[PDB]
Nucleic acid binder design. Sequence first.
DNA 1: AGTAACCAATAAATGGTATTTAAAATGCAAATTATCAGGCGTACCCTCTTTGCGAATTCGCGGCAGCGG
Length: 66
Amino acid sequence: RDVNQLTPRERDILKLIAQGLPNKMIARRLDITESTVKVHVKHMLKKMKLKSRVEAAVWVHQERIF
DNA sequence: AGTAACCAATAAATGGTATTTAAAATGCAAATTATCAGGCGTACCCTCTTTGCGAATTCGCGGCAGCGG
């Protein structure tokens, strides 16, 4: 239920990701293969029980949870 | 005051094939205390004596026994 069990740093990376950052630049910046980047975003997608980032980002912003 | 599905394009849509990471936790077998379980010994003198009293008045039957011509 609670996102904070995950690392805050990856949450900040994720906010940057939802700021329009494409996966290629993500892999280039984070020093991992694109496969690992996709695996990470896939993990975040199911762990938040979401189908798309738009609704989750809007919900995070509106109540200013983090 | 606004028609398109044209053909590329964009990476996101997944759920699937693995050598990793070390931390944890989870088990594992020692050391190290308590406590239990056996053995021995005892120098005034003491000497068959306790029992069962009756698996309790059955009875009827059988037979293997000792005495006996």
